[PDB]
Design a protein around this ligand. Structure first.
Ligand code: CLA
Ligand code: CLA
Ligand code: CLA
Ligand code: CLA
Ligand code: CLA
Ligand code: CLA
Ligand code: CLA
Ligand SMILES: CCCCCCCCCCCCCCCC(=O)OC[C@H](COP(=O)(O)OC[C@@H](O)CO)OC(=O)CCCCCCCCCCCCCCC
Ligand SMILES: CC1=C(/C=C/C(C)=C/C=C/C(C)=C/C=C/C=C(C)/C=C/C=C(C)/C=C/C2=C(C)CCCC2(C)C)C(C)(C)CCC1
Ligand SMILES: CC1=C(/C=C/C(C)=C/C=C/C(C)=C/C=C/C=C(C)/C=C/C=C(C)/C=C/C2=C(C)CCCC2(C)C)C(C)(C)CCC1
Ligand SMILES: CC1=C(C/C=C(\C)CCC[C@H](C)CCC[C@H](C)CCCC(C)C)C(=O)c2ccccc2C1=O
Ligand code: SF4
Lengths: 94, 733, 65, 183, 217, 42
């Protein structure tokens, strides 16, 4: 069953459809700074824990940082392990 | 003149009467009404009080553990749990006579003890605890955790550790961390405990901190996990010949989906619960990655809420402006939390009796009864508080301008429709339930029980048959051995589930009949009328036709005077106080039904309930009167037994209840004049006018009268029924 | 007599001293009552059951220990 | 400055003032300044204890001590642990209350009354960078020691020898599997 | 001045005005000044009696005499009730003169010499030495009784037992071992919590909410 | 305790702590929370 094949393929497919397919949609959706403004305008330490203290710059041209990577690879690992587990009991219901 | 005690109120500190003491006792935790209260200081004091509540909870658990270890029989109960009674703690009462020292010597103890109706023995035996040293160490650890939370509550009140107002109003991060870590990683760690400790200890293998790094939870350690061969963790489950706590019929699996019950313990499989918490942990961890934090991804709850505006304007503005309303109102959050927590407390009660999670539970009948009644009354109180705080929100926190046209304002817009329809459902259910019960009573009185209205609950029976109960012959979904729902589960939970649900000696989907129909409709009447009172106090909270400016008078206030026809019990607080009676009656019906159904099941006489629950003289004769015999004979002119304490507590609760009647019927104005006469008497009595009061005696206020009467009422209700329940279940079993 | 009783109370004639005496006396009294005085009074809770008690008679149906 | 991500600008609260600044505060934990000073001292203290700890584990393994570093507690010495622990609490409480009384004032490290301790004149910002970097390395190295010996598994140099004998057959992928063979 | 733990800050009432002041009043028992004077005198009285008792016990255990927890059971020239009556009668007048001397002087005296100081060695250095040796001897008698109750041996016999095997014959291997180990660890970590309180509230004092303290003022 | 588990309460513990918890600590508490209630503010 080659779990390396399965999980590498799931992660690669999800990273691909996150980079090439659903990146524009996710950027259109995640741009909430709108009526929906910042959580805090204050200068307290606890107001700073809610600000984006570190913008994750990426030299990827489409803007695919370690957070997009983390998310799409997490979905890929989850789906690959789902495939492996549903194959683990050598069958499915219907 | 000006006193010192109600530091949070200068108006109470300047009050020269006894009302100052009471109201400072009862306004202490209404932080918003405190003098000089800022919203930030409010949230910070709430945070500290939450730390204190956690510390108290962990100390209480530490004390339970400590007393079960020190004065309990846990090391003997694990040997013969079906036959040995669990000791709660020892009794040292110098008022005891020798007959009482002899009568309360139970459970193999050396002296007088209390028998645990708590279930903590079954719980701790199921999760791997076998010795008294385990419980001792757990109690020490939980006392340390309590001290740690106390220190945290002190610390986060200090200047450089007091969080900002916005840190509390950060909902996305709190939700992410509380779903992912507090719910999810906690469930993952509990799965780890079950896989490493509880399941091996149920297989007879001792796993503790001394050796848990040296024993494998599975013979194939973590290879099935990192290779995706997860079914290897379900290969050899525990057999049907398995005896809990031993290796005879052990099994090697740690994650199963067997379904049903462990046959020897009549409890859930520990591997099923491990897999349960693993699945739930994964689901909650991925759920806690939903909301937006400092990393650029995720949702903003404001966007989700403001986007969910239906077209057709069927909800108006929809959920526009609702994020601000929920996030800025602590009473909205508290009402939502109490609603959910009470609903899931009722879920706990309804599922722990049908699917007993703990070993040798469901054979400890007193424990089952006590747990169900406990969690259902807790749930009823919590659910009354949910609506109470919803009303407090509508009064204190609701801004009609910032909720212009959204679902929340759309509620108040058609509140008369809601209240009148709840009125219709309550009225219908009461009329017809009481009428059918009275018809059946009259028919049994005239000796013609074949003329009763015995409506078969075919809808709930159809549901039961959809779950695989083959007693009714519906043959629909899982009772149909040819359906796809049945076929697709046969490799899975369904064999165990269907062996467990068709066994009529457990409580998994009990057989129901017309008595169950009638009492379920009584339960519905109770729910509908309780929520009628509560919804009507929550929606008429900001004003009515009788009192349109009610929001200006607060949540609690005595009345608006005898003008405009009379305005007694006008406030939302009074609606809550009226709904607590109906809640207690609802949960009393619920727990009566539960206890009688299960008493007739445990006695092998289900026909008694099936034949006597269709009329209320059967409830009075065959449940309340029949089961009271051993209870009221706890002490008699011919001696006493261990039910003496429950007889005493029975009479105690009756007394408290009746005393509450004093504060509920008799109102302030008789007592103020009586107290004036007593004041005169004391000021004019020689040798006693030397002693004088510092706080002027006054009768209890109207709101305080209602509170104290409801408190005596509820405490008596609760103590009476707990005494009766334990004494009627512990007397037979 | 008045001198005797003004001097007997000389040490406890202040609130703090009297409450210290009361605390000392009451705590000592309850502690010696639990340790020694309850057994000296021959209390049934200090003697023990003197019997097998209600041990094996759990319920009328299930005679549990 | 070279930052932990290529092309990344370091956050605002992280100047190059402190020793080992590489712009690494993705959680933003050091955005308070007094807490950042306390966390700098905490980094230095955890790093010093981890440096001495990995030094002690490697000097226990390179030298001939009887048990593993993770079994040295379960060992009979001339003093029982029940009596060892309170002596250690006394001594280390003295030392740590003297260290803390000396971080309130002097805002710096030190031994008992010397803040900074520095008997030798080797103080330097480059030396502070080296301290914090070797301390981070030793912290990671001790968590390595612990997770690498999570059950009765290799000792540190034993594990390094095992990896150098057969690299593609003795690594984490072999040992997270074949765990029943180890226990 | 030195403190009871390094870098402690004394409370408001322990101004250093008194001798042996190390700022140790965590339960705030001495916030009243009359109570504080009475407690200084009681400290000194318990300390004097404990010094005499410590040297008496060390003497009686150094020579061939019965152990001090059994000496009351031995047989003497007078029956125990006559002894108790003579002791009560003597100490009534003795402690009455001492009580009058405290009400007048504020300090100690035997009967009529308000300061019992034939040899005029009443420095304040000597008052400090009295107080310190008295605290030490109070601890010493507490230890005498404690390690004669844990064992059935006297003070120097327990000392010899310790010196025979110091690592295994000590308080943490005794019947009271674990409780003392835990209380020692708690005591050693306690001052860091106290210094946290002093640090997070710079220069502020927190009332511990006790009865004797009148913490509402 | 001897060796089973340390910090086990003595046999006489209830006889002391039930009076303490029920007669003394409530007396202390009610006296203190009576002086504090009737205390006038300056
Ligand atoms: C998470 C739970 C939670 C939280 C945080 C709060 C918090 C609050 N509630 Mg809410 N509430 C809750 C649950 C909660 N409540 C539930 C479950 C109910 C329904 C029972 C209510 C019903 C409710 C009402 C009706 C009101 C509040 C009010 C308040 C506020 C102040 C209450 C006060 O001063 O306490 C003081 C409380 C007491 C002094 C306790 C009274 C005594 C009770 C009855 C227990 C007595 C037990 C007794 C000792 C047992 C004896 C047995 C023995 C003899 C054997 C505060 C914001 C009030 C408010 O906001 O006013 C605007 C208000 O009017 N709450
Ligand atoms: C046995 C006691 C009892 C009974 C019968 C009721 C009955 C009722 N309560 Mg509850 N209530 C009670 C105790 C009781 N209450 C207590 C102790 C309190 C605390 C103060 C409350 C507080 C309370 C509140 C706050 C609310 C109610 C409501 C209701 C009504 C709910 C609808 C319903 O069931 O209609 C069915 C009706 C009945 C069961 C009673 C009528 C009985 C028969 C069917 C009528 C005909 C009998 C006969 C022919 C009359 C002959 C008269 C003459 C010829 C002699 C109903 C009238 C709600 C309400 O009124 O809104 C709808 C509501 O909001 N009650
Ligand atoms: C069981 C319910 C109950 C109880 C106990 C009481 C009790 C009382 N009522 Mg009330 N009353 C009730 C129901 C009740 N009423 C109801 C339902 C109504 C209809 C509205 C009234 C209407 C009413 C009116 C109109 C009047 C009273 C009066 C009285 C008092 C007269 C008896 C008295 O003082 O004797 C002494 C006290 C008792 C007998 C109560 C029981 C106490 C026992 C002996 C236990 C003692 C406990 C002990 C101190 C231990 C303490 C424990 C410690 C930890 C706290 C007393 C306070 C009258 C009054 O106050 O004037 C005198 C009065 O005028 N009541
Ligand atoms: C940091 C640190 C810590 C916590 C320890 C802790 C320990 N070491 Mg290690 N060690 C360290 C650093 C550390 N060491 C370094 C840097 C070197 C070099 C060593 C070399 C070393 C050897 C060679 C041995 C230990 C041993 C021990 C144990 C007993 C120590 C003893 O008898 O008291 C020490 C008492 C002192 C008075 C010294 C204080 C200075 C104990 C587990 C012994 C043992 O039993 O290991 C299993 C042992 O044989 N250590
Ligand atoms: C604070 C640093 C530190 C650390 C990280 C450890 C870590 C450990 N200790 Mg040690 N220990 C320490 C300080 C420390 N100890 C101190 C200060 C003492 C008092 C002298 C002990 C006394 C001690 C004993 C007596 C035992 C351990 C044991 C253990 C192990 C726990 C069992 C396990 O995980 O396998 C683990 C390696 C146990 C062990 O070696 O397991 C085999 C064991 O029996 N420890
Ligand atoms: C180390 C112990 C010690 C020390 C330094 C002192 C010191 C003092 N005492 Mg105290 N005293 C002590 C033990 C001690 N006492 C004991 C054990 C008793 C009980 C027998 C007394 C009973 C006592 C009384 C009744 C009085 C004093 C007084 C004094 C003061 C003058 C006498 C003097 O300098 O003593 C010098 C002490 C020594 C040189 C010790 C030598 C001992 C060896 C065995 C020889 C001085 C502050 C007088 C005063 O005014 O103080 C307030 C006073 O009235 N003392
Ligand atoms: C200055 C007083 C003093 C001195 C010198 C000693 C000395 C001794 N005690 Mg004793 N002891 C004392 C006070 C003292 N104790 C007190 C107050 C208590 C009650 C808690 C006890 C209770 C006690 C028990 C139950 C046992 C000992 C034992 C011992 C011996 C081993 C050390 C040990 O583990 O105890 C450590 C003692 C404590 C943790 C109690 C607190 C001690 C305080 C902090 C004083 C510390 C010394 C002081 C700072 C400077 C010494 C001055 C000078 C003599 C150099 C040793 C001979 C053991 C023994 O006999 O083994 C054979 C034993 O089993 N002691
Ligand atoms: C180990 C056992 C548990 C110990 C717990 C702590 C003990 C507390 C000891 C208090 C010492 C005296 C306080 C000095 C008094 C003092 O400092 O006053 C402070 C405070 C009141 O302050 P005031 O306003 O009166 O002070 C003004 C004056 O100081 C003049 O300025 O005291 C109280 O509130 C009442 C406390 C009563 C405490 C005694 C209660 C008695 C308990 C015994 C009950 C026995 C019942 C059974 C009988 C058979
Ligand atoms: C250089 C470059 C490249 C490449 C790159 C790469 C290759 C990357 C990768 C990346 C990656 C490769 C990533 C990954 C990620 C991953 C992740 C993120 C994971 C996660 C996981 C998780 C989350 C898990 C979970 C879980 C568990 C733990 C167990 C079971 C259950 C579950 C599954 C749920 C190219 C050629 C294109 C070009 C451009 C540039
Ligand atoms: C007053 C107020 C308040 C409160 C309120 C409340 C308290 C409410 C409650 C509510 C509630 C308490 C609700 C409940 C609900 C429930 C539900 C909604 C359920 C559902 C269910 C379902 C949906 C199911 C499904 C299923 C079934 C049927 C079975 C099987 C499985 C499944 C899943 C298929 C607040 C604060 C908000 C504010 C405003 C005002
Ligand atoms: C009896 C009665 C009184 C008189 C009762 C008095 C004034 C209050 C009773 C106080 C005495 C001291 C008894 C208190 C006993 C409680 C056990 C005290 C517990 C409180 C602590 C928790 C603080 C009223 O003032 C009243 C007012 C309005 C409606 C109904 C009534 C009413 O029924
Ligand atoms: S005092 Fe009572 S009767 Fe009078 S208006 Fe108020 S609630 Fe109504």
């Amino acid at each position: 069953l080659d779990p390396q094949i399965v999980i590498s393929g799931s992660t690669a497919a999800f990273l691909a459809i996150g980079r090439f397919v659903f990146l524009g949609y996710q950027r259109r959706e995640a741009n909430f700074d709108s009526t929906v403004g910042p959580k805090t305008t204050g200068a307290t330490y606890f107001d700073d824990l809610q600000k984006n203290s570190t913008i994750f710059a990426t030299n990827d041209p489409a803007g695919f940082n370690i957070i997009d990577v983390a998310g799409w690879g997490a979905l890929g690992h989850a789906v690959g392990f789902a495939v492996l587990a549903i194959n683990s009991l050598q069958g499915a219901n219907l | 003149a000006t006193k010192l005690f109600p530091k949070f109120s200068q108006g109470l500190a300047q009050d020269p009467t006894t009302r100052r003491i009471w109201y400072g006792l009862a306004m202490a935790h209404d932080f918003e009404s405190h003098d000089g209260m800022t919203e930030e200081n409010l949230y910070q004091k709430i945070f500290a009080s939450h730390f204190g509540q956690l510390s108290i909870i962990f100390l209480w658990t530490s004390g339970n553990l400590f007393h079960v270890a020190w004065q309990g029989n846990f090391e003997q109960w694990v040997t013969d749990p079906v036959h040995i009674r669990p000791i709660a703690h020892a009794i040292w009462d110098p008022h005891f006579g020798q007959p009482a020292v002899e009568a309360f010597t139970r459970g193999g103890a050396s002296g007088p003890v209390n028998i645990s109706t708590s279930g903590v023995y079954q719980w701790w035996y199921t999760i791997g605890m076998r010795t008294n040293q385990d419980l001792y160490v757990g109690s020490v650890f939980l006392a340390l955790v309590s001290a740690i939370f106390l220190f945290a509550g002190w610390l986060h009140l200090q200047p450089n550790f007091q969080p900002s107002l916005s840190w509390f109003k950060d909902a996305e991060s709190r939700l992410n961390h509380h779903l992912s870590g507090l719910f999810g990683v906690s469930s993952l760690a509990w799965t780890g405990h079950l896989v490493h400790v509880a399941i091996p200890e149920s297989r007879g293998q001792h796993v503790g901190w001394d050796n848990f790094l040296s024993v494998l939870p599975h013979p194939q350690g973590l290879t099935p996990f990192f290779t995706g061969n997860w079914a290897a963790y379900a290969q050899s489950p525990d057999t049907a010949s398995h005896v809990f706590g031993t290796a005879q019929g052990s099994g090697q699996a740690i994650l199963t989906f067997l379904g049903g019950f462990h046959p020897q313990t009549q409890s859930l499989w520990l591997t099923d619960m491990a897999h349960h918490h693993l699945a739930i942990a994964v689901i909650f961890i991925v759920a806690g990655h939903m909301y937006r934090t400092n990393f650029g991804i995720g949702h903003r709850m404001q966007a989700i809420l403001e986007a969910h505006t239906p077209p057709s304007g069927s909800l108006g503005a929809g959920h526009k402006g609702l994020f601000d309303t929920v996030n800025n109102s602590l009473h909205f959050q508290l009402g939502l939390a109490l609603a959910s927590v009470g609903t899931i407390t009722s879920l706990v009660a309804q599922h722990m009796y049908s699917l007993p999670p703990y070993a040798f539970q469901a054979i400890d009948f007193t424990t089952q009864a006590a747990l169900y009644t406990h969690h259902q009354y807790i749930a009823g109180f919590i659910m009354c508080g949910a609506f109470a705080h919803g009303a407090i929100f509508f009064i204190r926190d609701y801004d009609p301008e910032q909720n212009k046209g959204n679902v929340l304002a759309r509620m108040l817009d058609h509140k008369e429709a809601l209240i009148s329809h709840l009125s219709w459902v309550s009225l219908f259910l009461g009329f017809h339930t009481l009428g059918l019960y009275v018809h059946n009573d009259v028919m049994q009185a005239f000796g013609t029980p074949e003329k009763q209205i015995l409506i078969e609950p075919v809808f709930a029976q159809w549901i039961q048959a959809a779950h695989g109960k083959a007693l009714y012959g519906f043959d629909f979904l899982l009772s149909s051995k040819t359906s796809a729902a049945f076929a697709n589960g046969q490799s899975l939970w369904l064999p165990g589930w269907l062996d467990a649900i068709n066994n009529n000696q457990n409580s998994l989907f009990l057989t129901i009949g017309p008595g169950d129909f009638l009492v379920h409709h009584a339960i519905a009447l109770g729910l509908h009328t309780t929520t009628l009172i509560l919804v009507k106090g929550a929606l008429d909270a900001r004003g009515s036709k009788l009192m349109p400016d009610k929001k200006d008078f607060g949540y609690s206030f005595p009345c608006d005077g005898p003008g405009r026809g009379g305005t007694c019990d006008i406030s939302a607080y009074d609606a809550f106080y009226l709904a607590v009676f109906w809640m207690l009656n609802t949960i009393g019906w619920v727990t009566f039904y539960w206890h009688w159904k299960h008493l007739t099941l445990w006695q092998g006489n289900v026909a008694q309930f099936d034949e006597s629950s269709t009329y209320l003289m059967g409830w009075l004769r065959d449940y309340l009167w029949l089961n009271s015999s051993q209870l009221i004979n706890g002490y008699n002119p011919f001696g006493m037994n261990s039910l003496s304490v429950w007889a005493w507590t029975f009479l105690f609760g009756h007394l408290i209840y009746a005393t509450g009647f004093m504060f509920l019927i008799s109102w302030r104005g008789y007592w103020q004049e009586l107290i004036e006469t007593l004041v005169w008497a004391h000021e004019k009595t020689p040798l006693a006018n030397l002693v004088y009061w510092k706080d002027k005696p006054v009768a209890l206020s109207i709101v305080q009268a209602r509170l104290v009467g409801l408190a005596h009422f509820s405490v008596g209700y609760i103590f009476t029924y707990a005494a009766f329940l334990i004494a009627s279940t512990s007397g037979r079993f | 007599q008045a001198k005797f009783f003004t001097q007997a109370t000389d040490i406890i004639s202040r609130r703090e001293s009297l409450r210290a005496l009361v605390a000392l006396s009451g705590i000592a009294a309850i502690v010696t009552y639990g340790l020694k005085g309850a057994k000296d009074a021959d209390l049934p809770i200090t003697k023990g059951p003197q019997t097998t008690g209600e041990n094996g008679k759990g319920g009328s149906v299930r005679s549990r220990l | 400055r070279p930052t932990w991500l290529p092309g990344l600008n370091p956050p605002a609260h992280l100047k190059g003032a402190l020793a080992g600044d590489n712009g690494f505060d993705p959680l933003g934990l050091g955005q308070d300044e007094g807490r950042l000073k306390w966390y700098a001292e905490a980094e230095k203290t955890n790093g010093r204890w981890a440096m001495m700890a990995v030094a002690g584990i490697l000097g226990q393994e390179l030298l001939g001590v009887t048990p593993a570093w993770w079994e040295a507690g379960a060992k009979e010495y001339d003093i029982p642990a029940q009596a060892l622990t309170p002596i250690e609490f006394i001594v280390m409480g003295f030392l740590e209350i003297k260290r803390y009384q000396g971080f309130k004032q002097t805002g710096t490290s030190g031994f008992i009354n010397s803040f900074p301790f520095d008997p030798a004149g080797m103080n330097s910002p480059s030396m502070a960078t080296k301290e914090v970097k070797n301390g981070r390395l030793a912290m990671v190295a001790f968590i390595g020691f612990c997770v690498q010996a999570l059950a009765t598994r290799t000792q540190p140099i034993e594990g390094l020898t095992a990896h150098l004998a057969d690299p593609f057959g003795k690594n984490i992928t072999y040992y997270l599997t074949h765990l029943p063979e180890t226990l | 001045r030195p403190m009871w733990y390094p870098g402690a800050t004394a409370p408001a009432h322990l101004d250093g005005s008194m001798l042996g002041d190390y700022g140790f009043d965590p339960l705030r028992l001495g916030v009243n000044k009359d109570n504080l004077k009475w407690f200084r005198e009681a400290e000194l009285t318990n300390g004097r009696w404990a010094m005499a008792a410590v040297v008496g016990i060390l003497f009686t255990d150094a020579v061939g005499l019965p152990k001090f927890w059994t000496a009351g059971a031995e047989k003497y020239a007078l029956d125990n009730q006559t002894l108790a009556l003579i002791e009560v009668a003597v100490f009534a007048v003795l402690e009455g003169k001492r009580y009058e001397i405290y009400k007048k002087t504020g300090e100690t005296g035997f009967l009529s010499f308000a300061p019992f100081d034939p040899m005029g060695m009443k420095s304040e250095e000597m008052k400090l030495k009295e107080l310190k040796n008295g605290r030490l001897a109070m601890l010493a008698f507490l230890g005498f009784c404690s390690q004669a109750a844990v064992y059935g041996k006297g003070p120097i016999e327990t000392l010899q037992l310790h010196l025979a095997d110091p690592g295994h014959n000590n308080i943490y291997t005794s019947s009271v071992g674990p409780e003392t180990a835990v209380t020692v660890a708690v005591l050693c970590v306690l001052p860091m919590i106290i210094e946290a309180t002093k640090t997070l509230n710079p220069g502020k004092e927190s009332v511990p909410y006790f009865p004797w303290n009148e913490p509402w003022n | 305790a001897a060796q089973g588990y340390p910090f086990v309460p003595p046999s006489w513990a209830p006889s002391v702590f039930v009076p303490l918890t029920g007669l003394v600590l409530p007396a202390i508490a009610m006296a203190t929370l009576f002086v504090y209630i009737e205390k006038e503010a300056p």
